[PDB]
């Protein structure tokens, strides 16, 4: 049985992480990072937020530098040895892509943009990317198999799927900048180096802006003001009718 | 539309007077009993 630890989204509870991972239990732990595809625009901001939180957590652990470099060597050896600590990025509510086509006029270029961003981030952290949909039950068994493989060392056989928009799967080591360059061919307006935020926009949700506080004047200032007061006492039609007048 | 945060006092956990200390003791105590049983 594999221990499961779900941290609340607020940083106020991030200090609970010390009770989820310890020095003895760090190598046995597999890290899962969730990305919400119903809110794609915050995905990388959230990912650098939580990854940075994990880096800060590992900093407070005070692992010996030799042991830390040993862990890095083990992880990288697992990395380059791939043929056709661990970090796995899981995308949730990818079926909301169907919403993005109808509500925000997205297209294959935008989806290529976000997934190329996600694969470059996975390269940065050496992670495996996967797309899921609990609503549609997509890639759940593929997930479970990969999780068991990477934790218990079980076998794995599924290949990398990078053609379908909402079912992408990339095991660790598969991705590379040359392999990521295929999506940049589909780009016709944006570039790989363009900023996330300028192209993909965070919608300005029409929150109820509470009205200005209307305040009654104080009695003294009001009476002073009253004392001061008391003591001192069509075209388009014309265009058409000009058009039919010139001729 | 009213979100879950607006509907209920989910954020009240962050308004404890002694910070998150009391929440840690709750989680720690669960860790202590499990450590002994294990």
UniProtKB/Swiss-Prot annotation, chain A:
Keyword Transport: yes
Keywords: ATP-binding, Cytoplasm, Cytoskeleton, Dynein, Methylation, Microtubule, Motor protein, Nucleotide-binding, Phosphoprotein, Transport
Assigned GO CC terms: centrosome; cytoplasmic dynein complex; cytosol; dynein complex; kinetochore; late endosome; membrane; microtubule
GO biological process entries: cellular response to nerve growth factor stimulus; centrosome localization; microtubule cytoskeleton organization; microtubule-based movement
UniProt subcellular location: Cytoplasm, Cytoskeleton
GO molecular function term, any single one: ATP binding
Family: Belongs to the dynein light intermediate chain family.
Oligomer and partners: Homodimer. The cytoplasmic dynein 1 complex consists of two catalytic heavy chains (HCs) and a number of non-catalytic subunits presented by intermediate chains (ICs), light intermediate chains (LICs) and light chains (LCs); the composition seems to vary in respect to the IC, LIC and LC composition. The heavy chain homodimer serves as a scaffold for the probable homodimeric assembly of the respective non-catalytic subunits. The ICs and LICs bind directly to the HC dimer and the LCs assemble on the IC dimer. Interacts with DYNC1H1; DYNC1LI1 and DYNC1LI2 bind mutually exclusive to DYNC1H.
Record's function text: Acts as one of several non-catalytic accessory components of the cytoplasmic dynein 1 complex that are thought to be involved in linking dynein to cargos and to adapter proteins that regulate dynein function. Cytoplasmic dynein 1 acts as a motor for the intracellular retrograde motility of vesicles and organelles along microtubules. May play a role in binding dynein to membranous organelles or chromosomes.
Name of protein: Cytoplasmic dynein 1 light intermediate chain 2
Species this protein is from: Homo sapiens
Name of the gene: DYNC1LI2
Curated annotation (Swiss-Prot), chain B:
Disease tied to this protein: Charcot-Marie-Tooth disease, axonal, type 2O: An axonal form of Charcot-Marie-Tooth disease, a disorder of the peripheral nervous system, characterized by progressive weakness and atrophy, initially of the peroneal muscles and later of the distal muscles of the arms. Charcot-Marie-Tooth disease is classified in two main groups on the basis of electrophysiologic properties and histopathology: primary peripheral demyelinating neuropathies (designated CMT1 when they are dominantly inherited) and primary peripheral axonal neuropathies (CMT2). Cortical dysplasia, complex, with other brain malformations 13: An autosomal dominant disorder characterized by global developmental delay with impaired intellectual development. Some patients show signs of peripheral neuropathy, such as abnormal gait and hyporeflexia. CDCBM13 is associated with variable neuronal migration defects resulting in cortical malformations.
Family (UniProt): Belongs to the dynein heavy chain family.
Recorded superkingdom: Eukaryota
Organism: Homo sapiens (Human)
Gene that produces this protein: DYNC1H1
Parent-protein residues present: 1011 to 1048 of 4646
Subunit structure: Homodimer. The cytoplasmic dynein 1 complex consists of two catalytic heavy chains (HCs) and a number of non-catalytic subunits presented by intermediate chains (ICs), light intermediate chains (LICs) and light chains (LCs); the composition seems to vary in respect to the IC, LIC and LC composition. The heavy chain homodimer serves as a scaffold for the probable homodimeric assembly of the respective non-catalytic subunits. The ICs and LICs bind directly to the HC dimer and dynein LCs assemble on the IC dimer. Interacts with DYNC1LI1; DYNC1LI1 and DYNC1LI2 bind mutually exclusive to DYNC1H1.
Subcellular location: Cytoplasm, Cytoskeleton
Role of this protein: Cytoplasmic dynein 1 acts as a motor for the intracellular retrograde motility of vesicles and organelles along microtubules. Dynein has ATPase activity; the force-producing power stroke is thought to occur on release of ADP. Plays a role in mitotic spindle assembly and metaphase plate congression.
Record remark on domains: Dynein heavy chains probably consist of an N-terminal stem (which binds cargo and interacts with other dynein components), and the head or motor domain. The motor contains six tandemly-linked AAA domains in the head, which form a ring. A stalk-like structure (formed by two of the coiled coil domains) protrudes between AAA 4 and AAA 5 and terminates in a microtubule-binding site. A seventh domain may also contribute to this ring; it is not clear whether the N-terminus or the C-terminus forms this extra domain.
The protein's name in its UniProt record: Cytoplasmic dynein 1 heavy chain 1
Span of the signal peptide: none
């Amino acid at each position: 049985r594999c221990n499961v630890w779900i941290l609340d989204g607020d940083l106020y509870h991030k200090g609970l992480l010390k009770f989820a991972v310890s020095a003895e239990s760090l190598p046995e732990t597999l890290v899962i990072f969730v990305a919400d595809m119903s809110r794609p625009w915050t995905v990388m901001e959230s990912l650098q937020k939580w990854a940075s939180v994990l880096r800060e957590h590992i900093d407070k652990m005070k692992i010996p530098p030799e042991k830390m470099r040993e862990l890095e060597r083990k992880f990288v050896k697992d990395f380059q040895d791939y043929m056709e600590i661990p970090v796995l990025v899981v995308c949730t509510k990818c079926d909301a892509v169907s919403v993005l086509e109808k509500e925000h006029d997205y297209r294959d270029e935008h989806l290529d943009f976000i997934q190329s961003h996600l694969r470059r981030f996975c390269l940065q952290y050496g992670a495996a990317l996967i797309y899921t949909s609990v609503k549609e039950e997509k890639n759940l068994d593929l997930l479970y198999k990969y999780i068991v493989h990477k934790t218990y060392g079980f076998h794995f056989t599924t290949p990398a799927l990078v053609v379908e928009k909402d079912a992408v799967f990339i095991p660790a080591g598969w991705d590379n900048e040359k392999k990521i360059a295929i999506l940049h061919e589909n780009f016709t307006t944006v570039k790989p180096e363009d900023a996330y935020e300028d192209f993909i926009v965070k919608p300005p949700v029409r929150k109820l802006v509470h009205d200005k506080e209307l305040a009654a004047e104080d009695e003294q200032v009001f009476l002073m003001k009253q004392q001061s007061l008391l003591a001192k006492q069509e075209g388009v039609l014309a265009s058409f009718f000009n058009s039919l007048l010139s001729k | 539309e009213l979100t879950e945060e607006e509907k209920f006092y989910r954020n009240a956990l962050t308004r404890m007077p002694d910070g998150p200390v009391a929440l840690e003791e709750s989680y720690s105590a669960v860790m202590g009993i499990v450590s002994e049983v294990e």
